[model samples]
Target: SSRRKWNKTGHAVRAIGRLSSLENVYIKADKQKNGIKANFKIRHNIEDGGVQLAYHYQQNTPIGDGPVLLPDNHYLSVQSKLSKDPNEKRDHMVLLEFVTAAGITLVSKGEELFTGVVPILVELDGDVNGHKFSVSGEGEGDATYGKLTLKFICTTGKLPVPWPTLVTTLVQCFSRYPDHMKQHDFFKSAMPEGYIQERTIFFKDDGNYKTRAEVKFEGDTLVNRIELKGIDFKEDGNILGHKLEYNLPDQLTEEQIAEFKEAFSLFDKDGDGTITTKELGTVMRSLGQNPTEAELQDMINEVDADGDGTIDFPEFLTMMARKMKYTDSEEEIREAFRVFDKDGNGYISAAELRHVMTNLGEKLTDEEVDEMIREADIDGDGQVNYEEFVQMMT
Candidate 1:
């Protein structure tokens, strides 16, 4: 079992679980200094169509005046418990909540994080350091602006950082992931000039470098040329690695063939050798995408090579090969832009930027966001128009 056991003398702890949609989405939480770090994956329902979010929490520790004594710090912890049964269709659910040391509820919402019903893979409610947080969602219906929403409640005490400052910081972190993972031609438009590259060498406390990567840039705004290599890397790939290799080939390598076979098996959930439109619809919905029946049929028509109304392994692989072929083409770039240009005004606005950033779980200040625009806003128009965006990226 991968479940963690609590230790009386331990200083830190962690837990991870698959998001009830097979293994497509994953959630992980780790105890941090006076708080915790929560991270999870959000699916885009297609090949390499996913986003990851890292949320950090800092507990509120208050200080007293020179002549006055302060009270002890108040801490809250969040735990997720899952109840699942194969016999029942909707018998799966994950309960998450924040509890005081005395076991009193600080906050919770019923059914908002239900597994089969809600698009949420997991919900987190807890207080760490001095911040109280409740986060969950997947853009079902009216909550279109944010696929995931995180809210912080204020306490009646001074925190290490002001509320606004904390929120801005949180937003900055919240807003960057989706764009970062999009992997489009214009994806690097917001990067700064002179940013030749940045590398991170992960090492132990003893200072032994274990893994590293370099993100290269050119002409100031061009960036995101990344390569990751390390001993700790997994065979499938590093889940947290910033760079993703979408190297398509004229013929499938042995590894690629095996991977494709695995993916095909997963899509054939009922042990069937082929995938039907209904199966595809269920999987897509689980990944937070709401494709209508018509859309599902259209998808089948596009990839169902034999006109048999279903997709086999060879058919699926053929479709994927074609999809990967246009990685940096203009058509694909425009499609990627449509992901972030929520209102479709032919430009990406600050509000849209902030919303997408938040959905990806970022925390950035106004000044910093403006700076990102300035990096690509060649016409000095404040917002980045498609022409400017294309120019900066290409």
Candidate 2:
């Protein structure tokens, strides 16, 4: 616990998870060997948004190059235990370098030093980086994507020197939080409720300053924008000091389908087209209790439109006009089941579906008490008699 040793520096921190490994990889100054003491290094593949190379050498081939590799100073930076185990195999590593033209350079770190070809490199070889950016997004299925990189160690004028430091270094080397916390399970994802950490030994007061590290992700909260990388000889050359911005509240509004069909046709007590389970137990016994089988299967999968599961009346007026009024209506689902069938009995029984599932209690099911006696026994006649339930509720 020597403070975790700047968090072991890099193994791409184990691709932060994979597929756009933590999302955002950018850094500019692609041409700079001529503006001064030449230097360059950029090989971002951020788990596979792939290619954005510059790292130059071997005969210096700079004019629109996409693929290049001549490494031989003695290569072997190998360390792909496939991310030390999260069921394994996520793949993400390539920090090679050799750039210059006015763009400060580094020459090489993991990928051996001298090579060539530079054409703004943005290649896409066999593709696997963070599992191809995580099957395209929202992380379908088992979900994964976690890579966090904020590297810039120039010293003076180049190596992504301005151009918003390469548009904030490829927007914070693909700022990631496991596909926005797997879309919405948000934090609480395993690996100790989520982790892809890094800090690296740093300390400065004066050695001729220069430092700026930022990875702002405003949604599920993650903010770090440190500075001390380049200029600012005591605020004179003016590279401003602290500029942090981290805002969060998390968002999900919900209501839209003309406000969930005007709050489910104001709880259609009998203007029936479909809404049994005793019309949602008289709106949960005036908000007293009931609503779990996972909140009634998330309200029968968001107001069950004729997937023949239930909730009809245009999917309970489109789930009560899209969750209370963010609002939808196309009408005619058998003339809204012929105006809720009150006593017309064309279809609606089990004593008018136990007054529409009286808030879903008094649990009964032989297959839901024989599908409310086969939808109040229609012509299969096992039972619905109040004139076939008032002629299917009039």
Candidate 3:
């Protein structure tokens, strides 16, 4: 089954693109069992400007298959670096290696249940720049069992969209069953403002009771409450369990409205109270995206509701709210460079190139090696610098 359709792709894309340079990205997750709760806290070390991880267990007995200490928690660390491009950077991608005794034990134990990683893979995506970053990962005891899955997708800009709260409710409902509904399909439907409903019913305790739940979205919030009806055991009408409720606001606050206005004004250069196609192109170039005049016109056409040949404040906001695609061969080229630059010297020497290709099991004669260098060495410096490498690859 699929999730009910909802209009949020643009929102998610816009939100994720903004976390290009935020330091100290942190994620915390917790779960309660038998009236006891366990917590996992992870952080990005800002001082050294890299990845840092620490997991602390509170009020619960430690469980694992290694020893030597009792009060030791899951201590993890890695060198953190942002992706060069703004869109990729917003993903907060990083490489994490397990280097601690605790990390080894934690990952080893995780392998017994779920995926385990000697080098952990953690990712924060889906509108991560917003106050609500939809964070998820597996293996190595980080965000294990999907207990810490939550969303704060809006709240980064002027308006506070409770996209996460509503999304969570729908996901939780879908989670109650397998092959029941897919979240993607649910999001693709036209859910108007008010009363989008989905229900789930499951039987337990030898068919003693029938559990019924209704999850719906109204205004800016999603309200989910469950009621249990007795089938054969009691027959008396009595509701069991607690009613779950979430107050998720989906509208812009007054301050956010002001900020939105200010944002429009910033782009509305020349104090014309509107953003022209040329003005939009200027902003795009400032963001490192070179948009041609025709492309700018196409962008405007996608958002121009009144067809005034220019974008007014309302239209400008709509344009800004939508997600913009970023396409540059440079981002991919740099990534390829990083792969070959084993020593991280920012330049690939002849020897380094030979070593990398050889490691890939490619046998090359001296003549072939010289030819390779000649092909990439645009400046004839006997090495493949970033620019030369791009030219060769392209």
Candidate 4:
């Protein structure tokens, strides 16, 4: 029951010209469960195929066990945890494939954006709710700059659910929102319009959801620029992209269309194809305004999770759905902004944004970071509030 593929050459290359010359490379992995840090570096010329990384081992506290080795003949199975040396295997680490020409080959989690096949032996000690790591593939034949590049990857998972049941629920739910099917400007911007069908699972935000989109994309300009579309954050309990949109069916029925329209009409006070918080509030106020101020605060608190004092179309839709009222029309067109605004303030000052990025472990020049923040802040207020932030996102 071996499930591994062995292909010669033409392998996945994360960093090109990996073996061009002599260079020092480092791999940093922070294990969340143990909060221990694993750091190792190696110096190699462009001609070496692969070299095992080793750490200085002194006393037996566990951070010193050097690079791990796997029997070359065996294929590491997915999801099946590997035992180090059963007798002394606290955590196993290994350098699977390295090259000066190609790049590190074996995947950590899977795909290039998501690190594939993370070497498990490395461990770290830190109070990380989510594991964060970096792998630098380096090679130097050139004299001056060794040209070291790194990609981050992390491991996360949850209990599994049967597929058929999952599929059925998706079909039923998506039938509730046909417009998401008719056209997904959101998906089109990130990928392509009509390239993929929208799915029902979009609304569910449970399962085993973990979002590290911001951290992972920090290294790639193209990936980061794809911000026209929001980063793939987790929803419900499932990690974003865990379920393929293709798995769900399309085709919204007439009855579903009418229901969607009814909900739409309720929100569209001015009928301008957008919804604003005031319009939504006007509609919600129609939900019975006699409640006390505390009740109103609770209502806002529940709906305005980020507390920008405004609600966008998507947020409004979900809120209405929860209350069994669908307001398809809100004269007010509010914006969905970057959630990194920890203060829940309406605007993200340049300084605030930079601090947030730095705390997230993102390294950026003051000029570069400020430029990005300003770009998102449409009004040139030197900060991005929800409205301006939303415009930049699209």
Candidate 5:
């Protein structure tokens, strides 16, 4: 097969996964310069939710720019590897060090890593000069984040670690904590942002315009917007392209959103927004099928929108809607509609809404339940008929 060549084009790549502790990184580049003019600028960010693995986004830094580049640097360095072997094809690894630019080595605690597990799906989106391809469909992939980033290992004493040495001191604090604190494990962690992550590559579309490329894309299926661009794009053979990761945003209606909030509260436990493994596990286990601890990480990675080992309310909703969506059966969905028709009149009413939501296996407030109805009641008739039910549920 002959290769496709383009004037000058930009490319993008993205991915999302579960975080074992609480560390996330973002990197991007300016898409300009090619061959003779090939020069690009890259900007990367690392956020540490140390102290506690449950809390993410605590500290933000740019590893590449730490004197050697970057500022406000608290993380060391990170490396990602993708497997190419058959069978183990979708497997990958993400390694990130949590010390500041000043540097922090736990003389003992060591670094952290993320591992992907089972049944990964590879989906194809659109096609052409700008085609999209990805794996770990349900968010089961390599996700990384370092903990102690907040409490023990993450000392405020490491602020903008003016330089080296002190960073080591930061890890030094993990000192006596060799066993007390939780260690890195594959099977545990909160979900990060949307799955497979997102990244946009810059390209200088040269020699005028050979053709137009369609746009719009996102990792999360609850997509709000997206654009067209090459991710695994190439030039002549394979010249320029840098892959990255990003998340998706809001889509639910007002009342619908309220239902999500009500549901999030059950796991938010004491509130404060941060949700742990068991918290969500409780909801899933209570809902029906009990997933393993690691599977919860996969779910978080699937529905999660933020970065690693933790979840916010919206993230919980993403997880909520995702689990519900995945369980769909033409008839499960049919039965979903079947039951809502309380009076057997083929339409849904508030009383039926109450009954269904009450048995949803989680708690729901009437106000919120009404909000859900408000969202689904397209005609504003104060109830969900067959059409509304199909529209909302489907």
Candidate 6:
């Protein structure tokens, strides 16, 4: 069974050669090269399953061999619990721990984000350095399979992290059922199907409006997607790339078109193009406006245009365009930095990051604050400057 692929291994090791003589090498491959090796063991010791991984990579060389990566007996792992409640659906409950070494030992436990295997997508939101705040435009996971693919993952990036270790760990965690598809139904369903589909929409929160005027009929999904033209996302996702192509005029910059897709997708929960009065309230409640019973119909009449009792995507965009438009993204980002900045100093430090987010609500730990700073502080200075702030934000 292909489920046999679960127990997999990789060994990537190479020593850089100097200009023949040691002194002949002013430049070390560490500056241009990276080396890594690791393996995954999906344990079924407990009730369901757990993920166990041991990885070691030459983060920076010239110091040469470092205890052969990991000691033969040294390994760390996390046990997982599955949701057994009938109504709860499939959710994998894992408290994963990772050790970041620099002569210190800190065990941070994070909730499992996802686990599946058709190509590896595992995301974890755990408590590390410690206070908390989470907003990522979309969950970003990069797992393209192939030996050389991970070979690049093993050896590339500004700060090399064998991200493949985490993903490969997930691959093992998924194949427990002995039969492949059943694991697809349960372990991977650790993510319910609906949840997976929802996660997909956020990614569309950024593709081209390329109206795929493809030519098919029964398979002619271009019809439903069309109204004639075929595009993906869904009804309005189709129309955002389609609607009023003749009359609406593509005045929207690339940004607005994508925004239009997300909004329409949100408002049209049913996925059939056009929004029902019931669907209209989803956006309304978020806006906090409790429009009157008659007011809802009047607003619909204004945008529904044809009074078909539904507000189609094209009309929705026309109404939305005139409602409000204009922004200074960088200025707003600066404004946010000002609030995080606290002191008049031109940078936001670790203590300030934890303090500001803690004040806002999610509890964060020290390492999470420092790690968050680590991701964007290009200079290794420990605090986030405005440029880094803008980079992180935009």
Query: What is the TM-score of candidate 3?
Result: 0.23
The clash count of every prediction, one per candidate, is 27, 94, 17, 47, 42, 16
State TM-scores per candidate: 0.24, 0.17, 0.23, 0.20, 0.27, 0.22
For model 3, how does the per-residue alpha-carbon lDDT over 138-204 read when each residue is reduced to its tens digit?
2222222212222221212321211211221221111110111111111112121111222222222
Regions of model 1 farther than 4 Å from truth:
1-249, 326-394
**Predicted candidate 4 versus true structure: per-residue lDDT over 1-394, tens digit per residue:** 0000000000100000111111221112223321111122221111112111112111101122222111111111001011123352222211122111101112111122212212111111111124322222211111011111222112222212211111111100001102212121111112110111111122222222111111112122212100011123344222232332111112345643444444554555677655454554554344223445544443333444234443345544443332221111111112112224546676777676566445323465587667776556566778777666435422
lDDT tens digits, residues 1-394, model 6? 1111100000000000000011100111222322212222221111111111122221211122222111111111222222123452322221222211110111001002222212222222211112121111111121111011111111111211112212222221122221111211211222221111101001122111111111111220111011011123333321122321111122567665455555566567779888777766544544334556565554454444344667788866654443222112243445546656778598989887766545432455785667777776888899889888656542
Q: Tens-digit lDDT track for model 2 on 52-168?
A: 222221111122222222221111011111111234133222222211111011111211110121112111111111111111001111111222222222222222221121222
Ranking by TM-score: 5, 1, 3, 6, 4, 2
**Model 4 — which ten-residue stretch has the worst lDDT?**
1-10
Worst 10 residues of 5 by lDDT: 5-14
Segments in model 5 whose C-alpha atoms lie over 4 Å from true places: 1-260, 303-308, 312-355, 360-386, 390-394
Better of 1 and 6 by TM-score: 1
Of 3 and 5, the candidate ranking higher by lDDT: 3
Error (Å) of candidate 6 at residue 315 is: 0.8
Q: lDDT tens string, model 5, 1-394? A: 0000000000000001112222323212211210001111122211211010111111111112111111121222222212222343222221223211111112111122122221122232322244322211222222223222111121122211111111111111111112212232101111111112222333222111011111111332121112223333343311222222211122456755555565556556668886777776765444344679887775454334434566776656544443332222243334445545656777777777666555444355676667666767788889877767656533
Cα-based lDDT for every prediction? 0.33, 0.27, 0.33, 0.26, 0.32, 0.31
Which scores better on lDDT, 4 or 5? 5
lDDT (tens digit, per residue) of candidate 1 on 188-256: 221222112212232221111111112222232111222222234222322223223222234557755
